[PDB]
């Protein structure tokens, strides 16, 4: 993991939820999604020209969504249709991601966590279905799919498991890769 896993951030990021939890869209596009410390952005009508490779997107149950144009994903939560979010590798080795509004937790701190998933301990109320954008189920878990190692090559050592999620009333049987 060249300069990727060395100093991303602790899995127990400091600060907690001071009170009510809000919805925020900080439009976070600074660096590649090397680790789970990221803030995706909502992208509407996209130019389906530079997109290359699979465009798997996470319902969470991953589904291949081919662009409806050649030389389009209006992100919405499954209760309102569509998918939570997803990522793609395009152009010259540049990886990009998109997802619902990055879920922020009301609190104080120099580096308060812009919770993209789970983060229950920092905020007892943070459920994936309401506070999640990308494929990270928990700060140390992923939804394993064939291109998972092509998108996050720093998650080789993780072990696979079979899990049953319940989003609303719908039941998702899925494999998830987590370490120990």
């Amino acid at each position: 993991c060249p300069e990727r896993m060395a100093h991303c951030r602790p899995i127990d990021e400091f600060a907690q939820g001071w009170g009510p939890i809000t919805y925020a869209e900080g439009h976070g596009s600074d660096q590649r999604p090397y680790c789970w410390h990221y803030a995706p952005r909502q992208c509407g009508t996209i130019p389906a020209s530079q997109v290359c490779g699979p465009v798997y997107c996470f319902t969470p149950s991953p589904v291949v969504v081919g662009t409806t144009d050649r030389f389009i994903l209006n992100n919405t939560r499954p209760p309102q249709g569509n998918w939570f979010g997803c990522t793609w590798m395009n152009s010259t080795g540049f990886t990009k991601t998109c997802g619902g509004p990055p879920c922020n937790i009301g609190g104080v701190g120099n580096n308060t966590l812009t919770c993209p998933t789970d983060c229950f301990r920092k905020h007892p109320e943070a459920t994936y279905t309401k506070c999640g954008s990308g494929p990270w189920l928990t700060p140390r878990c992923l939804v394993d799919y064939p291109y998972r190692l092509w998108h996050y090559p720093c998650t080789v050592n993780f072990t696979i498991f079979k899990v049953r999620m319940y989003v609303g009333g719908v039941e998702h049987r899925l494999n998830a890769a987590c370490n120990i």
Partner: antibody, heavy 123, light 106 residues
Framework: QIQLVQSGAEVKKPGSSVKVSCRAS????????ITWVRQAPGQGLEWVGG????????NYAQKFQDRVAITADESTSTAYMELSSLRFDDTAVYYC????????????????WGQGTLVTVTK | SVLTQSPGTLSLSPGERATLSCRAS???????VAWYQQKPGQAPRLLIY???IRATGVPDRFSGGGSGTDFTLTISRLEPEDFAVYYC????????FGGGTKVEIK
């Protein structure tokens, strides 16, 4: 798969809090869930709650919310259940069982159980 | 009152048949049911999960079944060591146990 369920508080007082422990010997702690189910002297079993100590988010039944907490210490491979605001109806035996499969937001069936710890509430 | 067992208390003698019933109220439940057994004091045991899959260590006498609703646990060739208080629970998204029949083998 030997649950040396440690006795908690055999005798308690109304309005007090009770911590019940459950120790898992062998296996890999942090991959299978621990579930707490209680049964009164003569009644049916009641699902108190459960936890999976890898997705840090315990599950509680509908009628045991805002009054029960569940924690898991992986460094010592133990699972604790803290029940507050005890009532004279709480007199029962609390078991500790293993979830067969990992579930998020749901429950599962219990494979191997453990010795029950009596919990007597009296004045 | 979601899951209930009609027969309530029961009493038979060895070499007989008992057919306990667990009546899921409204939802088909997607075929998620489990059956247990509780001796007079010992810990419960798991007999059937999914109503059609048998665990390890229990004989084939405990044959369970059901489709959509009204899952059943058929006990054939009753033995003296079959007295218990059987239980039925449905897991998944709506976890809840059921009523306890009171087989009275003698």
């Amino acid at each position: 798969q030997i649950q040396l369920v440690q006795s908690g508080a055999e005798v308690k007082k109304p309005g007090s809090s009770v911590k019940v422990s459950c120790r898992a010997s062998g296996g890999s702690f942090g991959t299978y869930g621990i579930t707490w189910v209680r049964q009164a002297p003569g009644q049916g079993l009641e699902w108190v709650g459960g936890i999976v100590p890898l997705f840090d988010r315990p599950n509680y039944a509908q009628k045991f919310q805002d009054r029960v907490a569940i924690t898991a210490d992986e460094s010592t491979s133990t699972a604790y259940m803290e029940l507050s605001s005890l009532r004279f109806d709480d007199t029962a035996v609390y078991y500790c069982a293993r979830e067969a499969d990992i579930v998020v937001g749901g429950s599962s069936y219990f494979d191997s159980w453990g010795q029950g710890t009596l919990v007597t509430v009296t004045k | 009152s979601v899951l209930t067992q009609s027969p309530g208390t029961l009493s038979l003698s060895p070499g007989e048949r008992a057919t306990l019933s667990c009546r899921a109220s409204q939802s088909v439940s997607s075929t998620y049911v489990a059956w247990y057994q509780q001796k007079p004091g010992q810990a419960p045991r798991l007999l059937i999960y999914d109503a059609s899959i048998r665990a390890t260590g229990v004989p084939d006498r405990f044959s369970g079944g059901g489709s959509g609703t009204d899952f059943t646990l058929t006990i054939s060739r009753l033995e003296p060591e079959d007295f218990a208080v059987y239980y039925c629970q449905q897991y998944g998204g709506s976890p809840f146990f059921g009523g306890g029949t009171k087989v009275e083998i003698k």
